[PDB]
Design a protein around this ligand. Structure first.
Ligand SMILES: Nc1ncnc2c1ncn2[C@@H]1O[C@H](CSCC[C@H](N)C(=O)O)[C@@H](O)[C@H]1O
Ligand SMILES: *C(=O)c1cnc2ccccc2n1
Ligand SMILES: *C(=O)c1cnc2ccccc2n1
Ligand code: NA
Ligand code: NA
Lengths: 8, 238
């Protein structure tokens, strides 16, 4: 997701 | 490795299509407000500047700004925007974990959504790189999505995009984004001036709906550990 993995 | 993912996203090859959810076509409200509050001074770095909207907003108000980003595609886009708007912001490719060549260049840093991609020791490498690239006494501002904000963004993106999963339930390690992880990141060479509740604007690719979600706005004071400072101190001492 947005954006921790980075970022999808 | 991470260069390719973001470059692909900016080329439009990811599930987001033409609009990554952070590429909102405007500066972040928090940074507009921070500017009006008078808390931006000197040479400005926008670290992980993406397509340049925050940096361009500041350029239009007379600030000397540099936007840096790992993605050459983003920087290409930001440069095109600068050309079209007729603004003189510096945009260049750089790894924010490195920043070699930018030593003691900046008086203020702004960060919208770069720091929150870093976790554990990588967040500390970023803190250190920023320390090296900043003038002594510089201030770094970091806008980071909270768990509360990410939970809302995730649910909204998951409903809109097939590839994106819905967020999990319950409160409860490395995926966490509390005030504490940000505090822990900027330890050596920095002092926490404040961590505030703030907002981060994003866009939904499907409807192009704009939403604001919860975020933390950190403000950190870079120490005065510099050879230039050491030399001033020596001049007065001797
Ligand atoms: N190690 C690194 N050094 C510099 N930039 C990086 C990086 N890792 C990721 N990035 C960049 O960080 C950005 C995160 S998205 C945020 C972009 C911009 N601040 C905005 O608010 O719109 C992406 O553009 C990505 O290319
Ligand atoms: C975002 O929703 C998300 C979920 N799972 C991932 C796995 C691996 C890389 C990035 C990811 N992003
Ligand atoms: C990235 O690795 C990743 C993995 N899972 C997620 C779930 C929910 C939100 C963000 C995520 N990011
Ligand atoms: Na669109
Ligand atoms: Na989904």
């Amino acid at each position: 997701x947005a954006x921790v993995x980075a970022x999808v | 490795h991470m260069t390719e993912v973001f470059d692909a996203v900016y080329r439009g090859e990811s599930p987001f299509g033409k609009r990554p959810p952070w590429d909102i076509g405007a500066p972040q409200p928090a940074y507009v407000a921070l500017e009006k509050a008078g808390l931006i001074q000197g040479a400005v770095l926008d670290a992980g500047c993406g397509t340049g909207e925050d940096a361009l907003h500041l350029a239009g108000l007379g600030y000397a700004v540099t936007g840096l980003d790992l993605s050459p595609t983003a920087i290409s886009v930001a440069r095109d925007k600068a050309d079209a708007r007729g603004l003189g912001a510096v945009f260049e490719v750089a790894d924010a974990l490195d920043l070699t060549g930018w030593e003691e260049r900046f008086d203020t840093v702004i960060d919208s959504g770069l720091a929150h991609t870093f976790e554990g020791d990588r967040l500390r490498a970023y803190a250190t790189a920023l320390h090296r690239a900043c003038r002594p006494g510089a201030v770094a501002h970091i806008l980071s999505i909270s768990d509360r904000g990410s939970a809302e963004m995730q649910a909204r993106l998951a409903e809109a995009i097939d590839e994106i999963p819905a967020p999990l339930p319950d409160d409860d390690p490395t995926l966490k984004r509390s005030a504490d992880h940000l505090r822990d990141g900027f330890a050596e060479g920095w002092t926490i001036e404040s961590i505030d509740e703030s907002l981060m604007r994003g866009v939904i690719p499907t409807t192009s709906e704009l939403l604001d979600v919860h975020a933390w706005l950190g403000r950190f004071r870079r120490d005065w550990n510099s050879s230039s400072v050491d030399k001033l101190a020596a001049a007065l001492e001797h």
